[PDB]
Amino acid sequence: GSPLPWCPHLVAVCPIPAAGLDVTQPCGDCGTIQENWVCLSCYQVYCGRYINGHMLQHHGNSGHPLVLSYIDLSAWCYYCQAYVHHQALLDVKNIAHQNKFGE
Ligand SMILES: O=C(O)CCc1nc2ccccc2c2nc(=O)c(Cc3ccccc3)nn12
Numbered sequence: 510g511s512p513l514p515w516c517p518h519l520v521a522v523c524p525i526p527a528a529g530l531d532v533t534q535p536c537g538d539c540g541t542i543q544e545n546w547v548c549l550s551c552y553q554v555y556c557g558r559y560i561n562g563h564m565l566q567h568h569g570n571s572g573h574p575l576v577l578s579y580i581d582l583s584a585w586c587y588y589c590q591a592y593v594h595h596q597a598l599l600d601v602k603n604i605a606h607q608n609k610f611g612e
């Protein structure tokens with residue numbers, strides 16, 4: 510489609526845990542190491558919809574809106590049904606990028 514420069518769910522993006530991110534963390538439900546996302550509200554890690562859809566499940570059972578892909582570090586908002594680019598996402602995207610690419 511077309512990514513958004515903002516969305517009304519950015520307010521749900523929470524502080525990154527001091528433990529940091531582990532981009533190789535497995536899905537908290539199924540333990541897959543593939544195509545995981547991290548929830549930008551509670552930082553639980555769950556798999557994408559092309560694996561077992563545990564992140565989508567987490568959205569449904571928590572309402573948490575925004576998730577970050579450990580594949581390509583894009584942010585998707587489940588409510589807006591769009592990718593979102595915004596300043597509020599840069600820190601988490603960068604901590605993820607550093608952990609991922611060994612920076
Ligand atoms: O997998 C998740 O749970 C999080 C990501 C996700 N969830 C959805 C849930 C319901 C309806 C639509 C989507 C959705 N549509 C998309 O285009 C994208 C981006 C994208 C991903 C992969 C290849 C190309 C584009 N992510 N996306």
Ligand SMILES: [Cl-]
Pocket residue numbers: 526527528529
């Ligand atoms: Cl912590």
Ligand SMILES: [Zn+2]
Pocket residue numbers: 536537538539540541555556560561562563564
């Ligand atoms: Zn899973």
Ligand SMILES: [Zn+2]
Pocket residue numbers: 548549550551552553567571573
């Ligand atoms: Zn969450």
Ligand SMILES: [Zn+2]
Pocket residue numbers: 516517518519574586587588589590
């Ligand atoms: Zn949104």
